[PDB]
């Protein structure tokens, strides 16, 4: 695994493509740990294999609005 990431889709990406994307992440060997489905903000979080990470980074501006490492926040 390349690590934990958060991926947000461009808003013109269809529901089928969104589903297809996540199924692919799992098929490659990754995981889906959270999914976001708000008007104007769709995406997911999970562990990504390197090939998925680079694919999403390359699709920035097309399929992907943003792809980033999943950071940690604290109560202090």
């Amino acid at each position: 695994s390349a690590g934990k990431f958060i991926v947000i889709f461009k808003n013109d990406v269809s529901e089928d493509k969104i589903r297809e994307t996540k199924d692919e992440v799992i098929a490659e060997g990754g995981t889906i740990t959270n999914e976001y489905n708000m008007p104007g903000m769709k995406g997911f979080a999970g562990e990504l294999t390197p090939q998925s990470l680079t694919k999403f980074q390359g699709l920035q501006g097309d399929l992907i609005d943003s792809i980033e490492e999943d950071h940690v926040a604290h109560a202090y």
Binding site: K4, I6, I8, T33, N34, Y36, N37, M38, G40, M41, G43, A45, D65, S66, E68, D70, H71, V72, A73, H74, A75, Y76
Partner: protein, 275 residues
Amino acid sequence: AQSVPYGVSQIKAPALHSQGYTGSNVKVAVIDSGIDSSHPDLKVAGGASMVPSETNPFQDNNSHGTHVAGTVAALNNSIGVLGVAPSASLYAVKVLGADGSGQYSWIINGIEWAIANNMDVINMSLGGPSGSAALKAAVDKAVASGVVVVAAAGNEGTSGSSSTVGYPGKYPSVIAVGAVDSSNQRASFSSVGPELDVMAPGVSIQSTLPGNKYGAYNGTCMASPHVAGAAALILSKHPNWTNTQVRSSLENTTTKLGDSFYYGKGLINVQAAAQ
């Protein structure tokens, strides 16, 4: 007997309570380590947990979330303390585990839940030093959806002329809250920077703790809920005001303190903000 923490009086919340404004029917999501729903001085309306290994949002294994919740809405009765908005509907949105940490992905799911469940106010007494496009999108979406979003500015103190405000507090859509003591002096640990919006009591703040306990905690994470509670008081009087109206009033009625880099617009005055 019930005690009114100095911070509640400092922001002038009692004046509104006496007028019948206590945050009734206002939904406040405490995005934190959960809330001990069994505390005699707290009433929890609902919630959800985004922490994989801790699925119960009503079990606060840290204590932080329960303390924050008490500052927002400890019940007005004959025991414990008194919250800023004692009649507010509290929602425990657990995104931090027992160790006080949580993934940004969980926090975002918590914000999504808050939006989906029509929360009026979100309080995030937490933060991280790393920026996040997704986290910004989430808080921006909540604000665009009409939610008043409040967060602790951070406890990183000063660092020359550099901002020390953490995320999500650092985002423009969020109201970043710094901490002052009972003398309106900025706490040494209170984060600073142009992203600091307002100040609230954050030193030795007495509130509810799990297991029918009470105690004084330090932090801009104690200051933040004073502002979240203040937003609830304002909405209980002006239920039709947009979050923009609530925020504008809070920031325009502060008691000016020191330089904005260190005190933002100053100490909130909810009595004045309630117009």
